[PDB]
Amino acid sequence: MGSRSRLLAANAAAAAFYAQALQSDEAAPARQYLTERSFDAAAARKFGCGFAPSGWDSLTKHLQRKGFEFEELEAAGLSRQGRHGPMDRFHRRLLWPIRTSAGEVVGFGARRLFDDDAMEAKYVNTPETLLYKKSSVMFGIDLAKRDIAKGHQAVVVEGYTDVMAMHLAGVTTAVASCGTAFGGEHLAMLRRLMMDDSFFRGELIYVFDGDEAGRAAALKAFDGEQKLAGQSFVAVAPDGMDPCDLRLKCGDAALRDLVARRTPLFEFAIRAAIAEMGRVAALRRCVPMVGQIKDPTLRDEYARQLAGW
């Protein structure tokens, strides 16, 4: 009663309820969002997409009629106390269920659809619960679990739709940061999956959108390496575009090629720091970045091109 397995059962029931609600008449703008960026009904079914209806307590009453207590639904991050009693967390938004590697639903990502939504924020998430941990949660990990372990390769994208675009394109190793900064506990989980017996072989591919944030995300690499920046790589789409948009304009094959055309994470972060730039401030900014490389042989390789670049 209020146990881990019970909280999981509520989320699975909520995922079913929300998935069904996507076919309602009021969920047409949610279906529009998906079809407008080329995700068909079968794709929406694969990732478990749903719609949080306009009834303020419609999930809560639905789960309450199946025997779930309000105390359990608050613990699961599904319901919360309103003025008139128990009410839903999510309201009039396109939902993606966020699943563990096994495939157990632990929370939801909720995107804004209507201009009269009281919540101004573009994306909204499940709060910190027993099951949901912002720092370790990853969208797409259930579907990619097998192919990253077999292929020894993980592709990290930013958004929910970027993962969907990647998996439909054939890049089934794609996963997302999931409503927060990526680093620390996802790397541990991804490293752990790509490990052969005893030693680390695989590689990690970050795919940033064409933006100033591309470099401003890449500088985080040097802030704690965790011996994975040597095996980390960077791909960047034609300026302005993210993976979801790239698949719309240039098709599924263009995304597979994007992942193939990857630069090492150090090389990218350094050469980008040199590119957008003088020589006084340059050699000040770049020599700490190279010095923080813990491997001596790999440090010497990049240390050569500081004179060149």
Annotated binding site for Mg(2+): 158, 209, 211
Contacts of 256 (CB under 8 A, 6+ apart): 169, 170, 171
Q: What is the largest CA-CA distance in the chain?
A: 70
Show me where the chain is broken: residue before each gap, C-N > 2.5 A: 277
Query: Collapsing DSSP states into helix, strand and coil, what is residue 282?
Result: helix
8 A C-beta contact, residue 165 and residue 244: yes
Binding-site annotation, residues = 158, 209, 211
Parallel, antiparallel or unpaired: strands 203-208 and 232-236: parallel
The DSSP element (H or E) to which 5 belongs, if any, is helix 4-21
- Say how far apart CA 234 and CA 251 lie, in whole Å: 20
